[PDB]
Every structure is written in C-alpha cells, then in structure tokens.
Amino acid sequence: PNHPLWYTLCDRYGLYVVDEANIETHGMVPMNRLTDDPRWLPAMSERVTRMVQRDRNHPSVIIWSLGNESGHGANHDALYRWIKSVDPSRPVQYEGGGADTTATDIICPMYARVDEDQPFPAVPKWSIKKWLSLPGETRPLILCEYAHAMGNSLGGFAKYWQAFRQYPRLQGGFVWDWVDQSLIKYDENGNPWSAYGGDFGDTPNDRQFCM
Amino acid sequence: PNHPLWYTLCDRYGLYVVDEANIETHGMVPMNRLTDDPRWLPAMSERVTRMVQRDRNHPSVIIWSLGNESGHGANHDALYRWIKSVDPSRPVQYEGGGADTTATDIICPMYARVDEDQPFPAVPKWSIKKWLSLPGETRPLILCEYAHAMGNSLGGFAKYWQAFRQYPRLQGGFVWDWVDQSLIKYDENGNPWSAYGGDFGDTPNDRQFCM
Ligand SMILES: CC(C)S[C@@H]1O[C@H](CO)[C@H](O)[C@H](O)[C@H]1O
Ligand code: NA
Ligand code: NA
Ligand code: NA
Numbered sequence: 001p002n003h004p005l006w007y008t009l010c011d012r013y014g015l016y017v018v019d020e021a022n023i024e025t026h027g028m029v030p031m032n033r034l035t036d037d038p039r040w041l042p043a044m045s046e047r048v049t050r051m052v053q054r055d056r057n058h059p060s061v062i063i064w065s066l067g068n069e070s071g072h073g074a075n076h077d078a079l080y081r082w083i084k085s086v087d088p089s090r091p092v093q094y095e096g097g098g099a100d101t102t103a104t105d106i107i108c109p110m111y112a113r114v115d116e117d118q119p120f121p122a123v124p125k126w127s128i129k130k131w132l133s134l135p136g137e138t139r140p141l142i143l144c145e146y147a148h149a150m151g152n153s154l155g156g157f158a159k160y161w162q163a164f165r166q167y168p169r170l171q172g173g174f175v176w177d178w179v180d181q182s183l184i185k186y187d188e189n190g191n192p193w194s195a196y197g198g199d200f201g202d203t204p205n206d207r208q209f210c211m
Numbered sequence: 212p213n214h215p216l217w218y219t220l221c222d223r224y225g226l227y228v229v230d231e232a233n234i235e236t237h238g239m240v241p242m243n244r245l246t247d248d249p250r251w252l253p254a255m256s257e258r259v260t261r262m263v264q265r266d267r268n269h270p271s272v273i274i275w276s277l278g279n280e281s282g283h284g285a286n287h288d289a290l291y292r293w294i295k296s297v298d299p300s301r302p303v304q305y306e307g308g309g310a311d312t313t314a315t316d317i318i319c320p321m322y323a324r325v326d327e328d329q330p331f332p333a334v335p336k337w338s339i340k341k342w343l344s345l346p347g348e349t350r351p352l353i354l355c356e357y358a359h360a361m362g363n364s365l366g367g368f369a370k371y372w373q374a375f376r377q378y379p380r381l382q383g384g385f386v387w388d389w390v391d392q393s394l395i396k397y398d399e400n401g402n403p404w405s406a407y408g409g410d411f412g413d414t415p416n417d418r419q420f421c422m
C-alpha cells in the first residue's frame with residue numbers, strides 16, 4: 001500500500017490503481033514456504049485486511065492484489081475469499097504460483113511473452129495469446145509486469161500492443177517499471193552521481209538490477 | 212454421404228470420418244433462404260435423418276455434419292438437436308452462418324487464417340488463435356476447410372501446423388482438397404487431355420476452380 005495521498009491524487013487526476021498487500025516472500029525456498037503455513041496466516045491476514053479497511057472507499061482502486069512473488073499458498077486462498085466476501089465491488093488478483101491459480105480473478109503473469117511459450121516446470125509462462133484459450137480458461141489476462149525496462153530496453157514493445165488490440169481478453173498490463181531506483185552519492189568534489197547496488201558497501205547486492 | 216464402401220475402408224484402414232448431409236444451398240440469396248424456411252424442413256430433415264440411420268454403426272464416423280454453405284437457419288437448429296437426441300455418441304458440426312453458431316459443437320471455419328482477422332460483416336473469419344479466446348467461447352476449433360490447394364499453392368501451410376501444435380484447442384483441420392476435379396477429353400488425334408469448367412460448352416462456368 002502506498003502513501004495515502006497517492007490514492008487521492010489518482011482519484012482526482014484519473015488513474016486506475018491496483019492496490020497491493022505488503023506481502024512478498026520471494027527469497028523463501030520454495031516461494032510459498034510461509035504463505036502455505038497456517039502459522040503465518042495471522043501476519044498475512046493483517047497486511048491484506050488492514051489495506052482493504054484503509055483504501056476501500058477510493059474509486060481509483062479498481063483491483064485488489066494479494067501481494068507479490070510469494071508462490072501460491074493456502075493463506076492466499078483464504079485471503080482471496082475474505083476480500084471477495086467483504087468487498088464484492090473489486091476483482092482480486094495475484095500472480096504467485098503460476099499467475100492463474102484459484103486465488104486470482106485475472107490471469108496476471110509477469111514477463112509472459114506474446115507468441116513464445118516458456119514452459120518452466122510447475123509455473124510455465126505461456127504465450128499470452130495461447131494462455132487465454134487453454135482448456136477451461138475463461139478469465140481476462142492483464143500482465144502484472146511486462147516489458148522489463150532495464151537500461152536500453154523495451155525492444156518488442158509494439159508486439160504486446162498489437163496483441164492487446166487484436167485480442168478482446170488481452171486487456172493490457174503494467175510495464176516494469178516507472179522509475180530507476182538509483183540513489184545519489186557525492187564524490188571527492190561534492191559532485192552528485194547515480195549509485196546502484198553495491199555502492200554503499202552493501203554486500204551481497206544485485207548491482208544495477210534496481211534500475 | 213459417400214458410397215457405402217468408403218466407411219468400411221475407413222473402419223479397416225483407420226481414418227476419422229466427418230459424415231456430411233447432402234445439403235448445400237450456396238447460391239441462394241441470402242445463403243439461408245431455404246434453411247430458415249419451415250417449408251424446406253421436411254426435405255432437409257430426410258437428408259440428415261437418413262444419413263444418420265445408414266451410417267451410425269461405423270466406428271470411422273466420429274463427427275456428424277449438417278451440410279455445407281447453407282447459411283444458418285432454424286432448420287439447422289432443429290436438425291442439430293435431432294442428432295444430439297438420437298446419437299449422443301458423436302459431436303455435430305456445421306460451418307454455415309459464421310462457423311460458431313448454436314448449430315455446431317465445434318468451431319469449424321473455412322479458410323480462417325492463422326494470425327490475420329478477416330472481419331466480414333455478419334460472418335467474420337477471425338484469426339484461429341483469436342477465435343478460441345473470444346469472450347465466452349470454450350469450444351474446440353477444427354477448420355472444416357483450409358489451405359486451398361488450387362494449382363501452385365499450400366503457401367504458409369507450416370504456419371497452420373505451428374499453431375495446431377502450440378494451442379491445445381486448435382485441433383487441426385481438413386485441407387481443401389484431396390483430388391483435382393479435372394475430366395478427360397479427347398482431341399482430334401484421340402489423345403486424352405485434362406479438362407476443366409467451360410471445356411464442355413458448359414456456360415456459365417467457373418473454369419479451373421474445380422481443380
Ligand atoms: C470463391 C469463394 C467466394 S467460395 C469458395 O470456393 C472454393 C473454390 O474451390 C470452395 O468451393 C470453397 O468451399 C468456397 O468457400
Ligand atoms: Na484487448
Ligand atoms: Na529490479
Ligand atoms: Na492443438
């Protein structure tokens with residue numbers, strides 16, 4: 001969840017918001033180790049329930065998200081249903097565990113490609129065109145993350161947009177991402193320079209991946 | 212419906228058969244002028260019911276077809292339901308009136324392209340990849356006719372097969388068609404040559420379109 005003013009500005013200027021719970025357990029092995037554990041249900045429930053209680057009156061918020069990169073656990077299903085119960089007015093989405101689990105109303109993959117399948121075990125990233133028509137699949141597809149804009153990037157961006165326009169149920173997505181997470185440091189002359197991971201003696205670090 | 216021996220041979224050699232009622236009213240304006248008319252229901256019904264009564268015991272027959280290129284009329288809906296009622300063992304297909312009407316268990320377009328939409332009024336031929344995922348659509352797609360093999364043709368045949376393998380619900384199609392309908396004529400020297408439309412004084416004719 002963002003600083004409260006953000007929702008007010010999105011209300012007034014006019015932007016659709018996905019409001020997302022402060023839950024990410026990416027570094028767990030496997031990713032759902034905590035989110036499938038009932039002992040972590042209370043801690044997760046608070047991050048979901050208190051977000052809804054704070055932001056449910058904002059018109060800009062049109063979709064609730066259960067968080068990010070935490071695999072798919074039973075705690076997600078419980079909290080998916082909690083939201084659907086207290087607020088039937090907004091769809092719930094969650095990408096973890098393969099982007100099309102029982103805890104999401106929207107197929108919301110990250111970095112799924114337009115035509116090319118990437119069939120990873122357990123959590124394949126199908127071609128988005130192909131994903132829509134998988135046997136039994138009826139849901140809209142909106143990428144929660146796509147077109148990773150790291151450095152000199154966004155090659156093939158037009159290919160997403162041609163597909164979004166041709167396919168009714170391909171309803172777009174959210175570019176990753178808006179702004180570089182670089183920080184300012186000063187050299188010997190007091191001159192500013194843009195710093196990334198590792199430049200603060202922080203170790204281990206992931207270098208320029210914050211940009 | 213074919214010569215009765217055809218189905219015996221397909222039973223024994225192993226080919227899947229689509230058995231098709233002898234109903235095509237292509238030249239009517241509009242195409243459904245007779246098939247929507249209850250006065251023509253009796254004549255139409257006999258062509259369907261008597262086909263089913265003859266052929267229902269052949270294992271090679273896996274799909275029933277209501278005919279070809281006769282628009283979509285209320286008589287199709289009646290006869291579709293008649294077949295589902297008497298023979299639950301076989302899906303019923305029919306391409307007329309847009310390839311995805313209430314008279315077909317299978318989206319069965321003719322000459323729908325792989326990636327390119329052809330948005331004709333009333334009866335569009337959507338791209339087959341796109342057709343599958345249209346809002347509310349769940350049926351399998353099998354082209355009743357594709358890859359028109361007229362003369363030097365089958366350009367882009369690979370493109371269909373790439374899509375067929377990639378998309379589970381694209382379950383193939385039927386090439387148009389097996390054999391050139393040329394006829395043998397004899398000149399002055401008594402030497403046989405291959406003849407097409409018009410070569411018999413027949414007029415109007417559609418020339419080499421029979422091949
Ligand atoms: C020429 C099109 C407007 S009709 C087109 O003609 C073809 C010619 O072989 C086949 O008969 C197809 O079934 C038919 O759709
Ligand atoms: Na779209
Ligand atoms: Na990053
Ligand atoms: Na297929």
Ligand code: NA
Pocket residue numbers: 420421422
């Ligand atoms: Na022909």
